[PDB]
Design a protein around this ligand. Structure first.
Ligand SMILES: *[C@@H]1O[C@H](CO)[C@@H](O[C@@H]2O[C@H](CO)[C@@H](O[C@@H]3O[C@H](CO)[C@@H](O)[C@H](O[C@H]4O[C@H](CO)[C@@H](O)[C@H](O)[C@@H]4O[C@H]4O[C@H](CO)[C@@H](O)[C@H](O)[C@@H]4O)[C@@H]3O)[C@H](O)[C@H]2NC(C)=O)[C@H](O)[C@H]1NC(C)=O
Ligand SMILES: *[C@@H]1O[C@H](CO)[C@@H](O[C@@H]2O[C@H](CO)[C@@H](O)[C@H](O)[C@H]2NC(C)=O)[C@H](O)[C@H]1NC(C)=O
Ligand SMILES: *[C@@H]1O[C@H](CO)[C@@H](O[C@@H]2O[C@H](CO)[C@@H](O)[C@H](O)[C@H]2NC(C)=O)[C@H](O)[C@H]1NC(C)=O
Ligand SMILES: *[C@@H]1O[C@H](CO)[C@@H](O[C@@H]2O[C@H](CO)[C@@H](O)[C@H](O)[C@H]2NC(C)=O)[C@H](O)[C@H]1NC(C)=O
Ligand SMILES: *[C@@H]1O[C@H](CO)[C@@H](O[C@@H]2O[C@H](CO)[C@@H](O)[C@H](O)[C@H]2NC(C)=O)[C@H](O)[C@H]1NC(C)=O
Ligand SMILES: *[C@@H]1O[C@H](CO)[C@@H](O[C@@H]2O[C@H](CO)[C@@H](O)[C@H](O)[C@H]2NC(C)=O)[C@H](O)[C@H]1NC(C)=O
Ligand SMILES: *[C@@H]1O[C@H](CO)[C@@H](O[C@@H]2O[C@H](CO)[C@@H](O)[C@H](O)[C@H]2NC(C)=O)[C@H](O)[C@H]1NC(C)=O
Ligand SMILES: *[C@@H]1O[C@H](CO)[C@@H](O[C@@H]2O[C@H](CO)[C@@H](O)[C@H](O)[C@H]2NC(C)=O)[C@H](O)[C@H]1NC(C)=O
Ligand SMILES: *[C@@H]1O[C@H](CO)[C@@H](O[C@@H]2O[C@H](CO)[C@@H](O)[C@H](O)[C@H]2NC(C)=O)[C@H](O)[C@H]1NC(C)=O
Ligand SMILES: *[C@@H]1O[C@H](CO)[C@@H](O[C@@H]2O[C@H](CO)[C@@H](O)[C@H](O)[C@H]2NC(C)=O)[C@H](O)[C@H]1NC(C)=O
Ligand SMILES: *[C@@H]1O[C@H](CO)[C@@H](O[C@@H]2O[C@H](CO)[C@@H](O)[C@H](O)[C@H]2NC(C)=O)[C@H](O)[C@H]1NC(C)=O
Ligand SMILES: *[C@@H]1O[C@H](CO)[C@@H](O)[C@H](O)[C@H]1NC(C)=O
Ligand SMILES: *[C@@H]1O[C@H](CO)[C@@H](O)[C@H](O)[C@H]1NC(C)=O
Ligand SMILES: *[C@@H]1O[C@H](CO)[C@@H](O)[C@H](O)[C@H]1NC(C)=O
Ligand SMILES: *[C@@H]1O[C@H](CO)[C@@H](O)[C@H](O)[C@H]1NC(C)=O
Ligand SMILES: *[C@@H]1O[C@H](CO)[C@@H](O)[C@H](O)[C@H]1NC(C)=O
Ligand SMILES: *[C@@H]1O[C@H](CO)[C@@H](O)[C@H](O)[C@H]1NC(C)=O
Ligand SMILES: *[C@@H]1O[C@H](CO)[C@@H](O)[C@H](O)[C@H]1NC(C)=O
Ligand SMILES: *[C@@H]1O[C@H](CO)[C@@H](O)[C@H](O)[C@H]1NC(C)=O
Lengths: 130, 441, 130, 48
């Protein structure tokens, strides 16, 4: 228990790591987002950052994943989006490459998530009516 | 075995010391209330029981903010009206000796000069009465400030009368007030209240005497950062006021000279009737009783069998060596020598009169390069005020002698604000807390 | 029912009250937190207050207590932090004194809460995999 | 050697060395300065 030091992972420290390993360091990235004319510019930048954070939180809440960093959902994964298996994704690829690969399939996924959340809410409301 | 578990609470009543920026609350003046919010008709206060706080008047951040705000408002008030650039010309001056006493001789100069007009190709000849403190010989004289910088004129329409101002904190911050009497500005206060914001404070500018202030509810109070050290000023607060009556009796006259397009300079035409010295009066018996109370309180800190001496000011500039104030728009500088002149040993209707001088070119704050020329006030002026405190300084203080000598002091205007914001402090809340409870998620 | 007056508690009216009584007035404190050069200063103060509120909300969400004022958790209480029983805490002490007492045991508690929340999320994700 | 389009002759070429070259510049005249008061708190500095 003597002879080894300790260090803390920095911002964007797991950029080159695999998706499985990089998914364990979400808090370090999440915490960084929040925190005469030059004063105007700085205040504008701060307000824009706050607005972006609020917009992201609202988008997360719209899908029913409010107050969560990891929230796996009910939408099935279409094979057309990506034919690669899990072993070739979470252990042999990084987040940047994954984002590059499926960059042109995101809006449909967001719409499907929104529709699924709406259907789930409607079903829950119908169930509670009894 | 404990079977107790952590639990998080948000919004718990816990605070800590912090610094922030308070905003206005106040019910043409130099201290612009236009940029200050209206005050609530019914202020609220919450008395906190079992809460004892720590207070220290000598490390309060509100004094610096008040000083900066006062200076800023002062700077803004003087912007939109005339600058007296052309006033620096060679003046041909003579002595005024028409119906004057033996003490006003040489204090007034009748000067004549050339001046510009609305058209830039024409000139006029004008004359005015100046004070001896404003002109320096170059029969040829010049204004005292032209070899330092050109500088503006006071603006006729705005008045110098102080008005109260309240400082209210933003969201997430609270103001704590100490209601414990006999609180000497430092230490633990057991009686505490939370106030949205403070009582009205008049920004009175004066030296060697605190005027139109607040009075102690118990007795005369003496405060000092380190009373053992002679380099720290001593603040004395009275329990009752002392009335003082100041006056300029000369019947002044005002005339306007057009020095350019929409630019007028106000000069003193002539004095109607006799010429006499402006002066102040203060009661003798009341002053003696107040000094008795002050020396009685001082004996608590400086021994019971010590001789206490009140003497004259050491020296320096006129502003620091003399009680300087503003009465009826005129800047009085007066020689408070008949007051602090006595010795105390352990054991009807006459009043003390202070004759004193007026000034027009003013360097209000301790800055070099910016004046303020006050236009003359027409007619006699009288004004009454309350004296409610003093700023003293201990001369020397060595162990060779068993006598303590105190002299009047001042100069720095932060002490004037410190005498009012001594019982207030600012804190910031800490809503998050953790406690033990018997759940389990 | 004729002769009794009614008033409302102040911003910090429960500061001197015990922890048990003071815990019933969390909303009065929570609501207050939200609500040329002088305008710059006021805007900076408002932006700083908003940023502090958002940071506090994010910190609460990281522990899984999002959208709650009271959220009792799974982390057990260590006797080293405090040996006083419940009767001497919730009925004979105030929040200020409690904060003063345990002021040097807070960061470890926060870390334990974060680790417990991470473990719970991982366990729930594993359970949902079946 | 760096250039946006080296083929084009209208673009400047930036050359970065690997070692520096020392250069010694000097004005050896023993100048004298005087002040002339041109107004209230305004001074112009001239070569005597
Ligand atoms: C401590 O507090 C006491 C009491 O609060 C202060 O004493 C008061 O001081 C004020 C201000 O000096 C005084 O009010 C003035 O009274 C004068 C006499 O009645 C008025 O003539 C005067 O009005 C003129 O000034 C106003 C601006 O202040 C103008 O708006 C107004 O139009 C008047 O101006 C006309 O007259 C002048 C002179 O002729 C002329 O040049 C103008 O062009 C214009 O024509 C004020 O109302 C109170 O009466 C005093 N109260 C008492 C009881 O004495 C004391 O000053 C404070 N101490 C300190 C150090 O500040
Ligand atoms: C200041 O000097 C001026 C100019 O010398 C005086 O004005 C003169 O007053 C006399 C009366 O005593 C008149 O006869 C002249 O015509 C005035 N001159 C001008 C140019 O108007 C003024 O009286 C003096 N004031 C004082 C207080 O001595
Ligand atoms: C105002 O200006 C006039 C001239 O424009 C001055 O009169 C001159 O005074 C000087 C002495 O300084 C004499 O040498 C000249 O001969 C005078 N000229 C004329 C035409 O009289 C006058 O002195 C100035 N006023 C003041 C108060 O200095
Ligand atoms: C109040 O002032 C006195 C006088 O300066 C302080 O006592 C002096 O402290 C210095 C510190 O270096 C010593 O060199 C002097 O010998 C001390 N003089 C005496 C007479 O004691 C005193 O410490 C100050 N009070 C506080 C609380 O700091
Ligand atoms: C200060 O006191 C003096 C007296 O010591 C006052 O002078 C008197 O003033 C009244 C005015 O009502 C006259 O009637 C008397 O004749 C004056 N007497 C003397 C001896 O001068 C003076 O007015 C007082 N001034 C102030 C501002 O209070
Ligand atoms: C200062 O002035 C006030 C009022 O101008 C004086 O108070 C007056 O004193 C006379 C004489 O005792 C009384 O008849 C009046 O009724 C008083 N009026 C008021 C409003 O108090 C006061 O005496 C003066 N003080 C000094 C030291 O000169
Ligand atoms: C305090 O009183 C002393 C003693 O009267 C003053 O000292 C006098 O100063 C003047 C110069 O203004 C001299 O002409 C006198 O000779 C001095 N007096 C003695 C006895 O030598 C002192 O000026 C007073 N303080 C103030 C601020 O004026
Ligand atoms: C402040 O007032 C005192 C008291 O009047 C002045 O002391 C007098 O100064 C004159 C100077 O001409 C001496 O002739 C007197 O003998 C002094 N009086 C006493 C009792 O010694 C003092 O000079 C005044 N302050 C200033 C700066 O003039
Ligand atoms: C000087 O002090 C006296 C006494 O403190 C003031 O008179 C008091 O004024 C207040 C105004 O809020 C009244 O509530 C009191 O009843 C008054 N007391 C007495 C005994 O009259 C006086 O106003 C002060 N003068 C100045 C100019 O500040
Ligand atoms: C670099 O500059 C050369 C010279 O201008 C470019 O080649 C020319 O491109 C223009 C485009 O209209 C033609 O009209 C010329 O005939 C070309 N000249 C030659 C000699 O090739 C070249 O395209 C530029 N490089 C890039 C990447 O744009
Ligand atoms: C630049 O080089 C010249 C020679 O080419 C230098 O001139 C010499 O300067 C020294 C100064 O120490 C004199 O002792 C010599 O007599 C000068 N010789 C000649 C021929 O002028 C000059 O000093 C150099 N300057 C710098 C700034 O390096
Ligand atoms: C970088 O890539 C190599 C092979 O592509 C891999 O062995 C290595 O683990 C990667 N780096 C990290 C930090 O995972
Ligand atoms: C004006 O009066 C003062 C004081 O009596 C005197 O010193 C000065 O010499 C006089 N100047 C004149 C008469 O020009
Ligand atoms: C202006 O003149 C006065 C008196 O002649 C002198 O004391 C002061 O130093 C002068 N100002 C400057 C900047 O030299
Ligand atoms: C008076 O001030 C001194 C400053 O050191 C302080 O120690 C003392 O406690 C104060 N008086 C009271 C009654 O608290
Ligand atoms: C001052 O002079 C004017 C003009 O002559 C006069 O009306 C006024 O009454 C005078 N003031 C006094 C106090 O006599
Ligand atoms: C100062 O007090 C003494 C008392 O010994 C007195 O003789 C003298 O006239 C007083 N001076 C002033 C200016 O009040
Ligand atoms: C203040 O403390 C006393 C005993 O120290 C206690 O009886 C009282 O209830 C406390 N105040 C409040 C508001 O609870
Ligand atoms: C320039 O002249 C001054 C004044 O004579 C002299 O002190 C100085 O040494 C001279 N400079 C050199 C480099 O000789």
């Amino acid at each position: 228990a003597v002879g080894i030091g300790a260090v803390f992972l920095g911002f964007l420290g797991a950029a080159g790591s695999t998706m499985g390993a990089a998914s364990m360091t979400l808090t370090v990235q999440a915490r960084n987002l929040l925190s005469t004319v030059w004063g105007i510019k700085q205040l504008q930048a701060r307000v824009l950052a706050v607005e972006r954070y609020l917009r992201d939180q609202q988008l997360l809440g719209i899908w029913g994943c409010s107050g969560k960093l990891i929230c796996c959902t009910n939408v099935p994964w279409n094979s057309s989006w990506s034919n690669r298996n899990l072993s070739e994704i979470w252990d042999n690829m990084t987040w940047l490459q994954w984002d590059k690969e499926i960059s042109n399939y995101t809006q449909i996924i967001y719409g499907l998530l929104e529709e699924s959340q709406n259907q789930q809410e409607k079903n829950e409301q119908d169930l509670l009516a009894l | 075995a404990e079977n107790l578990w952590v639990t998080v609470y948000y919004g718990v009543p816990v605070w800590k010391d912090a610094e922030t920026t308070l905003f206005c609350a106040s019910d043409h003046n130099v201290w612009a209330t236009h940029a200050c919010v209206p005050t609530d008709p019914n202020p609220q206060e919450i008395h906190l029981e079992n809460v004892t706080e720590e207070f220290n008047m000598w490390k309060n951040n509100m004094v610096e903010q008040m000083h900066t705000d006062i200076i800023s408002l002062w700077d803004q008030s003087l912007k939109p009206c005339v600058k007296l650039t052309p006033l620096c010309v060679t003046l041909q001056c003579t002595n005024v000796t028409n119906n004057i006493t033996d003490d006003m001789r040489g204090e007034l100069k009748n000067c004549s000069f050339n001046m510009t007009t609305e058209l830039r190709d024409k000139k006029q000849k004008v004359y005015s009465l100046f004070y001896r403190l404003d002109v320096v010989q170059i029969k040829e004289y010049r204004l005292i400030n032209c070899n330092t910088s050109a500088c503006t004129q006071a603006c006729p329409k705005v008045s110098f009368e102080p008005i109260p101002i309240h400082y209210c904190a933003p969201a997430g911050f609270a103001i704590l007030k100490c209601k414990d009497k006999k609180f000497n500005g430092t230490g633990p206060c057991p009686s505490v209240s939370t106030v949205q914001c403070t009582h009205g404070i008049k920004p009175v500018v004066s030296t060697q005497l605190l005027l139109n202030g607040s009075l102690a509810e118990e007795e005369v109070m003496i405060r000092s950062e380190n009373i053992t050290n002679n380099a720290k000023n001593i603040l004395v607060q009275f329990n009752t006021p002392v009335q003082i009556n100041c006056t300029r009796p000369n019947n002044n006259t005002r005339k306007s000279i057009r020095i350019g397009p929409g630019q007028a300079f106000y000069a003193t035409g002539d004095i109607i009737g006799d010429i006499r010295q402006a002066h102040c009066n203060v009661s003798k018996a009341t002053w003696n009783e107040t000094l008795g109370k002050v020396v009685k309180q001082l004996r608590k800190h400086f021994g019971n069998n010590t001789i206490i001496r009140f003497a004259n000011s050491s020296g320096g500039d006129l502003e620091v060596t003399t009680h300087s104030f503003n009465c009826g728009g005129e800047f009085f500088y007066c020689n408070t020598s008949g007051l602090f002149n006595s010795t105390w040993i352990s054991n009807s209707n006459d009043s003390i009169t202070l004759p004193c001088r007026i000034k027009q070119i003013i360097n209000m704050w301790q800055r070099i390069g910016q004046c303020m020329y006050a236009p003359p006030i027409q007619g006699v002026i009288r004004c009454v005020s309350n004296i409610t405190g003093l700023i003293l300084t201990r001369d020397g203080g060595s162990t060779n002698s068993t006598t303590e000598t105190f002299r009047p002091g001042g100069g720095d205007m932060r002490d004037n604000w410190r005498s009012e914001l001594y019982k207030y402090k600012v804190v910031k809340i800490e809503p998050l807390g953790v406690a033990p409870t018997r759940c389990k998620r």
